[PDB]
Amino acid sequence: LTEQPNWLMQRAQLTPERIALIYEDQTVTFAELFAASKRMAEQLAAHSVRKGDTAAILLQNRAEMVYAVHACFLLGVKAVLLNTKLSTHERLFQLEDSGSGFLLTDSSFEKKEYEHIVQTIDVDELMKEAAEEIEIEAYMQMDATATLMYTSKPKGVQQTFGNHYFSAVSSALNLGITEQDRWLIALPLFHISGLSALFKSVIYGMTVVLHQRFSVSDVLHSINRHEVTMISAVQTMLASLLEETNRCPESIRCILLGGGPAPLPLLEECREKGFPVFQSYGMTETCSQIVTLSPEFSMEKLGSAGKPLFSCEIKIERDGQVCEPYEHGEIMVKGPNVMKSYFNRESANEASFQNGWLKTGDLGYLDNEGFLYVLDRRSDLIISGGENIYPAEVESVLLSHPAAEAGVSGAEDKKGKVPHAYLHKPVSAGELTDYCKERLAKYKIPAKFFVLDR
Amino acid sequence: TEQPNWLMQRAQLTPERIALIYEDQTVTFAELFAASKRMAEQLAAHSVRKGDTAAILLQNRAEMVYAVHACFLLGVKAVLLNTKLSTHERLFQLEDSGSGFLLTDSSFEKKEYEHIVQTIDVDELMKEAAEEIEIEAYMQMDATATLMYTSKPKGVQQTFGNHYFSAVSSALNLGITEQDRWLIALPLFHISGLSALFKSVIYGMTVVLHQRFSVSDVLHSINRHEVTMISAVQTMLASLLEETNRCPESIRCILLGGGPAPLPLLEECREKGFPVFQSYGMTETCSQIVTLSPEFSMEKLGSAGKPLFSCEIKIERDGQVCEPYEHGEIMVKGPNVMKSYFNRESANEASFQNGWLKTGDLGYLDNEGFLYVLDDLIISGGENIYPAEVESVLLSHPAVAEAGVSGAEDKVPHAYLVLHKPVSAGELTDYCKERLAKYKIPAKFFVLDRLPRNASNKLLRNQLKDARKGELL
Numbered sequence: 001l002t003e004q005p006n007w008l009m010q011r012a013q014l015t016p017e018r019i020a021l022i023y024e025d026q027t028v029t030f031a032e033l034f035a036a037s038k039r040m041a042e043q044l045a046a047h048s049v050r051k052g053d054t055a056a057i058l059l060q061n062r063a064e065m066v067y068a069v070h071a072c073f074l075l076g077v078k079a080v081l082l083n084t085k086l087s088t089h090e091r092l093f094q095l096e097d098s099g100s101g102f103l104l105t106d107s108s109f110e111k112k113e114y115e116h117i118v119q120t121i122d123v124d125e126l127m128k129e130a131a132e133e134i135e136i137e138a139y140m141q142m143d144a145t146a147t148l149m150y151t152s153k154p155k156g157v158q159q160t161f162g163n164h165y166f167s168a169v170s171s172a173l174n175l176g177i178t179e180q181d182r183w184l185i186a187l188p189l190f191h192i193s194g195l196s197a198l199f200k201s202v203i204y205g206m207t208v209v210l211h212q213r214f215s216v217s218d219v220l221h222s223i224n225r226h227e228v229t230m231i232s233a234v235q236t237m238l239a240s241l242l243e244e245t246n247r248c249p250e251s252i253r254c255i256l257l258g259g260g261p262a263p264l265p266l267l268e269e270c271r272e273k274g275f276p277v278f279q280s281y282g283m284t285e286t287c288s289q290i291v292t293l294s295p296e297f298s299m300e301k302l303g304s305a306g307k308p309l310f311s312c313e314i315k316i317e318r319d320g321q322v323c324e325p326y327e328h329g330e331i332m333v334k335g336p337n338v339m340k341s342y343f344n345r346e347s348a349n350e351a352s353f354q355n356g357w358l359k360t361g362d363l364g365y366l367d368n369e370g371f372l373y374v375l376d377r378r379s380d381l382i383i384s385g386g387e388n389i390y391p392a393e394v395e396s397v398l399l400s401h402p403a404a405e406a407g408v409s410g411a412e413d414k415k416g417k418v419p420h421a422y423l424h425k426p427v428s429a430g431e432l433t434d435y436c437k438e439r440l441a442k443y444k445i446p447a448k449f450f451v452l453d454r
Numbered sequence: 455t456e457q458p459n460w461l462m463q464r465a466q467l468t469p470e471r472i473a474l475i476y477e478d479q480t481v482t483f484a485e486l487f488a489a490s491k492r493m494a495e496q497l498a499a500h501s502v503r504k505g506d507t508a509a510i511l512l513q514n515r516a517e518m519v520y521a522v523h524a525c526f527l528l529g530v531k532a533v534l535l536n537t538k539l540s541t542h543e544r545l546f547q548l549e550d551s552g553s554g555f556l557l558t559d560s561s562f563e564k565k566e567y568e569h570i571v572q573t574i575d576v577d578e579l580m581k582e583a584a585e586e587i588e589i590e591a592y593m594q595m596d597a598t599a600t601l602m603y604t605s606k607p608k609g610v611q612q613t614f615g616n617h618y619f620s621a622v623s624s625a626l627n628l629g630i631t632e633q634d635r636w637l638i639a640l641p642l643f644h645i646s647g648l649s650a651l652f653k654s655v656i657y658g659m660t661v662v663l664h665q666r667f668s669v670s671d672v673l674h675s676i677n678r679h680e681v682t683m684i685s686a687v688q689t690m691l692a693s694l695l696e697e698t699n700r701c702p703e704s705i706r707c708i709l710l711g712g713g714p715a716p717l718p719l720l721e722e723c724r725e726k727g728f729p730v731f732q733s734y735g736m737t738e739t740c741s742q743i744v745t746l747s748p749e750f751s752m753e754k755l756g757s758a759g760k761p762l763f764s765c766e767i768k769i770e771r772d773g774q775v776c777e778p779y780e781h782g783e784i785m786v787k788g789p790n791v792m793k794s795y796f797n798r799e800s801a802n803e804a805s806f807q808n809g810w811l812k813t814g815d816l817g818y819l820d821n822e823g824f825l826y827v828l829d830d831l832i833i834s835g836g837e838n839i840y841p842a843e844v845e846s847v848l849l850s851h852p853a854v855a856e857a858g859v860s861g862a863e864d865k866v867p868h869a870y871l872v873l874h875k876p877v878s879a880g881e882l883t884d885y886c887k888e889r890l891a892k893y894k895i896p897a898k899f900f901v902l903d904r905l906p907r908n909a910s911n912k913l914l915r916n917q918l919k920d921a922r923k924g925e926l927l
């Protein structure tokens with residue numbers, strides 16, 4: 001159990017003419033995908049890219065981005081997926097820290113700004129080059145780093161082939177899988193939600209319908225035209241889908257919702273329109289979701305992330321002791337999808353792992369049936385009169401008020417700390433206080449309110 | 455390295471889903487966990503401990519499912535015994551497996567094993583009070599979960615990892631949905647039946663369990679319980695065909711065991727709408743390792759299909775890979791392939807080659823990568839030598855009354871003869887040289903008083919070497 005046949009290679013052998021990828025006006029079969037990825041690997045090799053090297057990728061959602069990721073695997077190269085939305089400065093830090101020798105990008109980015117720290121390669125230019133055929137890496141080592149993905153000083157998450165494989169399988173056991181399934185991705189492939197779908201695609205033999213960005217009209221048209229059954233969304237995406245439909249598209253059986261709990265109004269709308277929304281919890285460190293909540297529980301387990309996927313585990317601890325149901329503590333996770341360690345962060349690794357468990361940095365609790373409730377980041381915790389104040393919970397309450405457009409709460413000095421709130425239309429301190437008192441324990445109610453422009 | 459115990463986690467995730475339907479009684483995953491934990495507690499009370507080995511001798515019933523899971527929860531290796539085996543065969547496997555216990559019921563004669571093992575009656579056992587224990591919450595992926603004997607029989611060590619990957623790989627191949635229900639009417643002590651129990655807890659899928667195959671009872675069950683998958687052997691399938699005009703409409707997959715099936719069976723299945731997935735695998739692979747979709751059944755006669763995901767097959771002769779349609783030894787590799795035979799280092803050394811397992815069958819691939827299994831006995835060579843062809847030539851000699859040939863390492867053929875009259879090795883060699891390709895000529899000649907044959911009078915070539923004598927020099 002140390003190595004597997006390269007997923008794309010085996011998938012192309014098993015079902016060569018099934019569709020791997022739909023992008024714009026293009027359909028790519030698994031045979032075509034393997035061929036394109038092998039070709040690109042040959043071209044990279046001609047640019048002196050070698051087994052054991054590290055290559056970064058800076059691209060928008062494109063077919064070529066999918067080729068490049070798979071080409072890296074076929075060469076035995078670690079792929080560093082870079083966030084397009086960061087500053088060049090931040091990008092340079094990750095290039096240095098990751099030890100990347102190469103940057104795979106295109107002319108829509110400022111290539112010259114990177115040419116001093118890595119060999120910068122334009123993918124469109126590269127694909128037109130001649131190159132000698134090579135022998136590809138026909139096996140994936142399960143414990144080898146496949147991708148490196150930075151947190152947000154950022155830490156590089158080492159995601160192994162094993163991690164990605166077990167994420168895909170556990171998700172399949174949770175959601176079910178059939179030959180008719182097709183997954184629509186309109187979020188960035190450099191984030192683990194999008195990236196993981198590429199791996200599900202070759203492992204399941206499942207088509208990915210790839211969009212460069214989210215446009216609700218384009219997505220609805222694509223769902224109907226390309227028989228989409230699954231889709232990953234954030235809340236603003238789900239809100240727009242709901243707004244533009246009379247009912248859920250008949251083919252959609254799973255909407256995988258990231259970005260935390262859905263508000264009750266949104267879930268009630270999903271119920272009426274038949275949107276099968278799976279809420280979830282996960283992170284870069286767990287190679288996408290590790291906990292999910294089925295649609296049938298969405299009303300009765302309001303605010304819950306759900307239960308762990310098969311093979312994965314969660315627990316709640318406080319000072320190294322395990323908590324009772326409903327008792328608050330740090331969320332810790334364990335499973336074959338969980339990262340082994342951060343790249344070159346000895347102290348971070350030492351602090352983050354306890355006996356094969358990863359500490360998430362999140363606080364939460366389990367109910368008597370084992371459903372997870374995520375409360376806030378441990379680091380944002382505010383202590384008032386010995387009681388815990390979770391700013392995120394207070395901010396969420398305030399945000400649910402029609403008019404607050406934005407909200408942040410911080411600890412203010414007092415004699416030990418009290419919550420202050422920093423916030424569409426005018427509203428009195430009295431009205432806000434009444435509102436919060438209904439929804440929050442007395443010590444969590446903001447002592448003072450401030451209105452700002454942003 | 456480790457996973458949470460599958461039944462424990464399944465009971466935590468979906469407690470109210472139905473795990474087992476047996477004689478129309480329903481058992482939820484939560485109930486299955488409770489029963490298995492209680493049985494484990496009752497077993498510990500009878501001095502069963504982590505690291506022990508316990509044999510199970512039962513017909514299909516809910517209690518047999520409890521017994522397998524109870525063993526896992528105690529950290530006990532489970533030996534699943536073929537109930538059709540004779541008393542002496544059972545005795546051999548109990549001793550060879552290192553079993554300390556035998557879990558059975560009053561339908562078997564437990565007393566005749568008590569000189570080898572402590573015997574436990576499962577029905578008496580389940581009535582008993584017993585102190586609660588802490589179960590083994592984790593399954594070690596590399597640890598032996600079950601021991602299952604081949605047809606000397608060899609004990610196949612099947613790890614938790616093996617069973618897990620077999621289950622996951624089959625799901626990737628066949629698909630899985632919350633509506634699926636899998637009917638099992640063949641023995642749970644065979645790997646096809648046993649593997650359904652692990653699919654059950656890992657997928658969270660209902661198994662409809664029959665004590666035995668009765669065709670009318672199985673048809674009624676398929677209709678009543680909306681069965682979508684079923685495991686069968688050829689005799690089973692033939693009976694289903696005879697009792698229907700069209701396949702029951704809920705069935706989406708009939709997983710047929712035992713390798714490629716005969717054309718007339720396949721043709722009638724197609725006509726009647728039976729979706730037969732052919733397959734090939736073994737105890738050593740923890741169930742199927744290749745499968746063939748129904749739409750290929752008539753067009754790829756003799757094929758068992760393509761490898762499950764993560765799994766590999768190759769055709770080899772003398773370490774050389776074979777071209778398409780070229781015959782060679784079928785060899786397999788994957789996370790579902792067994793650890794090793796238990797306490798049988800000779801068989802391990804003979805069966806494995808650079809990490810691949812030799813199946814002992816010959817086959818070939820077509821152009822599209824589909825595996826065909828040939829219906830033997832032969833030696834290579836590195837060409838082919840049918841011992842029967844060499845034996846036929848030797849037999850035709852006037853001084854030779856009987857001949858047997860087997861492979862030896864000098865890989866060459868050796869001959870074993872019963873003679874009417876004396877004849878020299880030189881003469882026999884030349885006699886063969888005139889009638890046979892040069893790599894088919896026996897390198898050594900032995901003169902025996904008789905040749906070993908089985909009850910059907912077939913020559914047992916594997917026994918010739920040990921019987922060697924009267925070498926012609």
Ligand SMILES: [Ca+2]
Nearest residue numbers: 849850851854
């Ligand atoms: Ca003769």
